[PDB]
Short mmCIF file of C-alpha atoms in Angstrom, two decimals:
data_model
loop_
_atom_site.label_atom_id
_atom_site.label_comp_id
_atom_site.label_asym_id
_atom_site.label_seq_id
_atom_site.Cartn_x
_atom_site.Cartn_y
_atom_site.Cartn_z
CA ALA A 801 -8.12 -0.63 0.44
CA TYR A 802 -5.27 0.42 -2.21
CA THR A 803 -1.51 0.79 -1.94
CA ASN A 804 1.15 1.75 -3.71
CA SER A 805 2.98 -0.66 -6.18
CA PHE A 806 6.48 1.43 -6.45
CA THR A 807 8.39 -0.60 -8.82
CA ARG A 808 7.16 -4.01 -8.28
CA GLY A 809 5.72 -6.32 -10.99
CA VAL A 810 9.10 -6.70 -13.33
CA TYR A 811 9.78 -9.72 -14.88
CA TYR A 812 12.26 -11.00 -17.74
CA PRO A 813 9.95 -10.98 -21.00
CA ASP A 814 12.15 -13.82 -22.48
CA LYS A 815 14.83 -16.06 -22.11
CA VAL A 816 17.42 -13.97 -23.56
CA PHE A 817 20.81 -13.04 -22.07
CA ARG A 818 22.12 -9.83 -22.07
CA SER A 819 25.14 -7.91 -20.37
CA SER A 820 25.72 -4.49 -19.16
CA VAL A 821 23.11 -2.67 -21.51
CA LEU A 822 19.87 -1.21 -21.60
CA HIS A 823 17.05 -2.80 -23.81
CA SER A 824 13.89 -1.32 -24.66
CA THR A 825 10.60 -3.50 -24.40
CA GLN A 826 7.14 -3.27 -25.20
CA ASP A 827 5.08 -5.70 -23.02
CA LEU A 828 2.57 -6.32 -20.14
CA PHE A 829 3.57 -4.79 -16.93
CA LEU A 830 2.54 -3.64 -13.84
CA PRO A 831 2.66 0.07 -13.95
CA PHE A 832 5.06 2.20 -11.54
CA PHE A 833 3.24 3.64 -8.56
CA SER A 834 0.23 2.20 -9.43
CA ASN A 835 -2.91 1.74 -7.03
CA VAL A 836 -2.68 -2.22 -6.32
CA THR A 837 -5.95 -3.74 -4.54
CA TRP A 838 -4.80 -4.70 -0.88
CA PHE A 839 -6.77 -7.61 1.00
CA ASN A 840 -11.87 -14.42 -0.93
CA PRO A 841 -13.84 -13.01 -3.84
CA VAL A 842 -13.41 -13.98 -7.33
CA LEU A 843 -11.33 -11.17 -9.18
CA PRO A 844 -11.40 -10.54 -12.71
CA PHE A 845 -8.29 -11.56 -14.77
CA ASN A 846 -8.15 -9.07 -17.41
CA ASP A 847 -4.76 -9.34 -19.78
CA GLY A 848 -2.82 -10.17 -16.59
CA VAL A 849 -2.51 -10.17 -13.09
CA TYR A 850 0.39 -9.45 -10.44
CA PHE A 851 0.14 -11.26 -7.16
CA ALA A 852 1.91 -10.53 -3.99
CA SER A 853 1.83 -12.04 -0.69
CA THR A 854 3.41 -11.95 2.76
CA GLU A 855 3.49 -15.21 4.25
CA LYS A 856 4.87 -16.55 7.88
CA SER A 857 3.12 -20.12 7.82
CA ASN A 858 2.20 -20.54 4.29
CA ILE A 859 -1.50 -19.66 4.37
CA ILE A 860 -2.19 -18.73 0.97
CA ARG A 861 -1.27 -21.94 -1.34
CA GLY A 862 -3.90 -22.32 -3.77
CA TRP A 863 -5.16 -20.36 -6.84
CA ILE A 864 -8.03 -20.98 -9.26
CA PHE A 865 -8.40 -19.54 -12.82
CA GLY A 866 -11.20 -19.63 -15.33
CA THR A 867 -14.52 -18.09 -16.84
CA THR A 868 -17.36 -20.22 -15.52
CA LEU A 869 -15.58 -21.96 -12.41
CA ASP A 870 -18.38 -24.76 -12.12
CA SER A 871 -16.99 -27.57 -13.75
CA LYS A 872 -18.97 -26.42 -17.10
CA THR A 873 -15.39 -25.27 -18.51
CA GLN A 874 -11.68 -25.89 -17.91
CA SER A 875 -10.78 -24.64 -14.83
CA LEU A 876 -6.88 -24.23 -13.86
CA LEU A 877 -6.09 -25.26 -10.40
CA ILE A 878 -2.69 -24.48 -8.92
CA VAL A 879 -1.85 -25.73 -5.40
CA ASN A 880 1.69 -25.36 -3.86
CA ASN A 881 5.22 -30.21 -4.29
CA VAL A 882 3.54 -27.97 -6.92
CA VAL A 883 0.35 -29.54 -8.19
CA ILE A 884 -1.16 -27.98 -11.48
CA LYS A 885 -4.34 -29.30 -12.78
CA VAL A 886 -6.72 -28.27 -15.44
CA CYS A 887 -9.52 -30.68 -14.55
CA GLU A 888 -12.99 -29.34 -14.76
CA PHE A 889 -13.39 -29.52 -11.03
CA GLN A 890 -17.06 -28.59 -9.11
CA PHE A 891 -16.68 -26.51 -6.54
CA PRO A 892 -13.06 -23.82 -1.28
CA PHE A 893 -10.53 -24.25 1.25
CA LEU A 894 -8.17 -26.08 3.48
CA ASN A 895 -12.34 -34.08 -18.64
CA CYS A 896 -8.61 -33.66 -17.38
CA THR A 897 -6.41 -32.59 -20.19
CA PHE A 898 -3.39 -31.95 -18.27
CA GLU A 899 -1.49 -32.74 -14.70
CA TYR A 900 1.90 -31.69 -13.46
CA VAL A 901 3.62 -32.44 -10.16
CA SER A 902 6.44 -30.94 -8.71
CA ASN A 903 8.78 -13.65 3.52
CA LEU A 904 7.39 -11.80 0.48
CA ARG A 905 6.40 -14.10 -2.48
CA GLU A 906 5.53 -12.06 -5.79
CA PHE A 907 4.11 -13.82 -8.81
CA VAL A 908 3.06 -12.73 -12.33
CA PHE A 909 0.12 -14.90 -13.98
CA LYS A 910 -0.63 -14.16 -17.84
CA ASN A 911 -2.26 -15.89 -20.55
CA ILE A 912 -0.61 -15.09 -23.91
CA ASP A 913 -1.70 -17.35 -27.09
CA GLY A 914 -2.69 -20.08 -25.13
CA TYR A 915 0.64 -20.16 -23.21
CA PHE A 916 -0.19 -19.67 -19.47
CA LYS A 917 2.92 -18.17 -18.14
CA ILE A 918 3.98 -18.01 -14.46
CA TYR A 919 7.08 -15.97 -13.22
CA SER A 920 7.51 -16.03 -9.25
CA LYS A 921 10.52 -14.22 -6.87
CA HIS A 922 10.76 -15.01 -3.38
CA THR A 923 12.48 -12.55 -0.78
CA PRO A 924 12.75 -12.59 2.84
CA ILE A 925 11.38 -9.17 4.34
CA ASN A 926 11.91 -7.29 7.35
CA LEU A 927 8.41 -5.95 7.15
CA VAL A 928 5.07 -7.21 7.80
CA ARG A 929 2.58 -5.00 5.77
CA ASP A 930 2.97 -3.35 2.43
CA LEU A 931 5.14 -4.03 -0.62
CA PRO A 932 8.58 -3.08 0.73
CA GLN A 933 10.99 -0.64 -1.49
CA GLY A 934 13.18 -2.30 -3.91
CA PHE A 935 13.61 -3.75 -7.28
CA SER A 936 13.86 -7.49 -8.38
CA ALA A 937 12.56 -9.00 -11.57
CA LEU A 938 10.53 -12.10 -11.33
CA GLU A 939 11.93 -15.05 -13.22
CA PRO A 940 10.01 -17.48 -15.40
CA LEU A 941 8.83 -20.55 -13.76
CA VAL A 942 5.77 -22.21 -15.56
CA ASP A 943 5.08 -21.99 -19.32
CA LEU A 944 1.95 -24.19 -20.33
CA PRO A 945 0.28 -24.06 -23.46
CA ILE A 946 -3.25 -25.35 -22.06
CA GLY A 947 -5.19 -22.69 -23.61
CA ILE A 948 -7.73 -22.15 -21.26
CA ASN A 949 -9.77 -18.88 -21.64
CA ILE A 950 -9.62 -17.11 -18.43
CA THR A 951 -11.62 -14.07 -17.33
CA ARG A 952 -11.71 -14.21 -13.43
CA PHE A 953 -9.53 -16.22 -11.00
CA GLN A 954 -9.52 -16.83 -6.85
CA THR A 955 -7.12 -17.40 -4.01
CA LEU A 956 -7.13 -20.44 -1.81
CA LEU A 957 -5.93 -20.44 1.83
CA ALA A 958 -3.58 -13.47 5.28
CA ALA A 959 -3.41 -10.21 3.35
CA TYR A 960 -2.43 -10.43 -0.55
CA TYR A 961 -2.04 -7.59 -3.30
CA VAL A 962 -3.31 -7.89 -6.72
CA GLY A 963 -2.74 -5.73 -9.79
CA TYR A 964 -3.28 -5.77 -13.55
CA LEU A 965 -0.64 -5.65 -15.96
CA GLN A 966 -0.79 -2.91 -19.21
CA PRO A 967 0.78 -2.63 -22.37
CA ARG A 968 3.64 -0.39 -21.58
CA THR A 969 7.50 0.26 -22.72
CA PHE A 970 9.91 -0.27 -20.25
CA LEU A 971 13.73 0.17 -20.50
CA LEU A 972 15.26 -2.74 -18.74
CA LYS A 973 19.05 -2.25 -17.42
CA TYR A 974 20.72 -5.66 -17.48
CA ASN A 975 24.10 -5.84 -15.58
CA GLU A 976 27.43 -7.83 -16.57
CA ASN A 977 25.60 -11.14 -15.09
CA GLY A 978 22.47 -10.70 -17.35
CA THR A 979 20.27 -9.53 -13.84
CA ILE A 980 17.52 -6.85 -14.46
CA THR A 981 18.66 -4.33 -11.82
CA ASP A 982 16.61 -1.31 -13.05
CA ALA A 983 13.76 -0.34 -14.90
CA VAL A 984 12.34 2.92 -16.39
CA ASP A 985 8.56 3.03 -17.19
CA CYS A 986 8.57 5.26 -20.34
CA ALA A 987 5.06 6.38 -19.44
CA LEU A 988 5.53 7.32 -15.82
CA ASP A 989 6.55 11.01 -15.98
CA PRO A 990 8.06 13.53 -18.42
CA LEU A 991 11.99 12.41 -17.14
CA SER A 992 11.55 8.87 -17.53
CA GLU A 993 9.94 9.50 -21.15
CA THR A 994 13.03 11.46 -21.73
CA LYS A 995 15.21 8.34 -20.26
CA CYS A 996 13.59 6.07 -22.61
CA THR A 997 14.04 8.52 -25.67
CA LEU A 998 17.61 8.75 -25.11
CA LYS B 716 37.80 -2.19 -66.78
CA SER B 717 41.46 -1.73 -67.94
CA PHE B 718 44.33 -3.75 -69.91
CA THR B 719 47.14 -1.43 -67.95
CA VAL B 720 47.09 -1.21 -64.47
CA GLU B 721 48.92 1.88 -62.24
CA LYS B 722 50.93 1.51 -59.39
CA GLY B 723 48.79 1.34 -56.38
CA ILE B 724 46.65 -0.94 -54.14
CA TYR B 725 43.02 -1.82 -55.48
CA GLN B 726 40.12 -3.54 -53.74
CA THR B 727 39.19 -6.38 -56.05
CA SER B 728 37.16 -9.14 -54.00
CA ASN B 729 35.91 -10.42 -51.05
CA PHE B 730 37.39 -13.26 -48.91
CA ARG B 731 34.67 -15.53 -46.66
CA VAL B 732 35.82 -18.36 -44.67
CA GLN B 733 33.21 -21.21 -45.76
CA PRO B 734 31.65 -23.69 -43.13
CA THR B 735 33.43 -27.08 -42.72
CA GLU B 736 30.33 -28.82 -41.56
CA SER B 737 26.66 -28.78 -40.30
CA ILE B 738 26.06 -29.40 -36.24
CA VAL B 739 22.45 -30.00 -35.28
CA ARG B 740 21.92 -30.79 -31.59
CA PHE B 741 18.90 -31.45 -29.38
CA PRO B 742 18.49 -32.21 -25.60
CA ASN B 743 19.77 -35.24 -23.77
CA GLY B 744 16.24 -36.49 -24.69
CA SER B 745 14.62 -36.39 -28.55
CA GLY B 746 14.21 -32.90 -29.75
CA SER B 747 12.40 -34.30 -32.68
CA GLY B 748 15.75 -35.26 -34.29
CA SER B 749 18.92 -36.80 -34.10
CA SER B 750 21.77 -34.55 -32.46
CA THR B 751 25.19 -34.52 -33.66
CA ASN B 752 28.49 -33.85 -32.25
CA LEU B 753 29.75 -30.59 -30.93
CA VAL B 754 32.57 -29.11 -33.03
CA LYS B 755 34.77 -26.35 -31.57
CA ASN B 756 37.13 -23.61 -33.04
CA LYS B 757 35.82 -23.97 -36.47
CA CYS B 758 33.16 -22.42 -39.14
CA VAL B 759 30.15 -24.68 -38.88
CA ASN B 760 26.33 -24.63 -39.60
CA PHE B 761 24.89 -25.09 -36.11
CA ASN B 762 21.51 -25.63 -35.17
CA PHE B 763 20.41 -25.32 -31.62
CA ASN B 764 16.95 -26.38 -30.92
CA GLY B 765 16.13 -24.83 -34.24
CA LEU B 766 18.33 -22.04 -33.98
CA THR B 767 20.25 -21.88 -36.82
CA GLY B 768 23.35 -20.02 -37.89
CA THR B 769 26.70 -19.98 -39.39
CA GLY B 770 30.06 -19.20 -37.23
CA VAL B 771 32.77 -20.43 -35.02
CA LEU B 772 31.45 -21.89 -31.64
CA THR B 773 33.90 -21.22 -28.52
CA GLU B 774 33.84 -21.88 -24.83
CA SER B 775 32.36 -18.77 -23.21
CA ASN B 776 32.54 -17.38 -19.79
CA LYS B 777 29.31 -15.32 -20.09
CA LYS B 778 27.03 -16.84 -17.41
CA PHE B 779 23.59 -17.75 -18.49
CA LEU B 780 20.78 -17.65 -15.95
CA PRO B 781 18.93 -21.01 -15.50
CA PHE B 782 15.97 -20.10 -17.50
CA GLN B 783 18.21 -18.37 -20.26
CA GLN B 784 18.79 -19.97 -23.34
CA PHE B 785 20.35 -17.79 -25.92
CA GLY B 786 22.46 -14.79 -25.90
CA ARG B 787 21.88 -11.51 -27.92
CA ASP B 788 24.42 -8.64 -28.64
CA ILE B 789 23.74 -4.90 -28.74
CA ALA B 790 22.39 -5.35 -32.20
CA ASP B 791 20.15 -8.16 -31.01
#
């Protein structure tokens, strides 16, 4: 199945504060109104992943990232007390080089220059299916320079939504408090292209 | 380039307040260096976690987000 992304998949591209200003940025984003797969099978990672999940009892809690996923290479396991491991575990439901120990949940996972970055945002909802209408930027939570090559990933236990990021240009609107309240996808349509131009 | 000056107002030089001292600061742990005391309301050469510059540091009302470390203006 598939569903409409609407305006989801927006995150703060940096840690820079801005106030009541429109800023043009070029980065990996989830294209507005794109087809996101709606649902576990092993899924490709590509250049980035937008993940979303509706939860009533915290069913989906684990994520696996890697290329082989057979203990031959580094495998990134994240289990929500958030525990993040890179052990070459042999593999799923319920040579270590790193270990860290700490409603709609939205996450952005990407790997740039050996830095695995995880952004997240949680919000209560009045619906139980499909991504609801609205806008909210995802804040960074994890930035680990592990260097794991990732070409596939899987979830570990409920339906969840998966989309893929693309190198697009976005016009972000920072309010007086530095919160991104609106975004324009420059490539969506001619009107948005005009907005970006001006 | 004259030995005689007519009545008027002439733009001659440029005034530039010079920095007093260098302020280097790192987190409460060890930012791979020794931190210095913070000096406010004075032209100083500041260095915050490797971000270097020269200017006057004043107490701000701007509300950075928890993950936000620096602030940029319209000209970036």
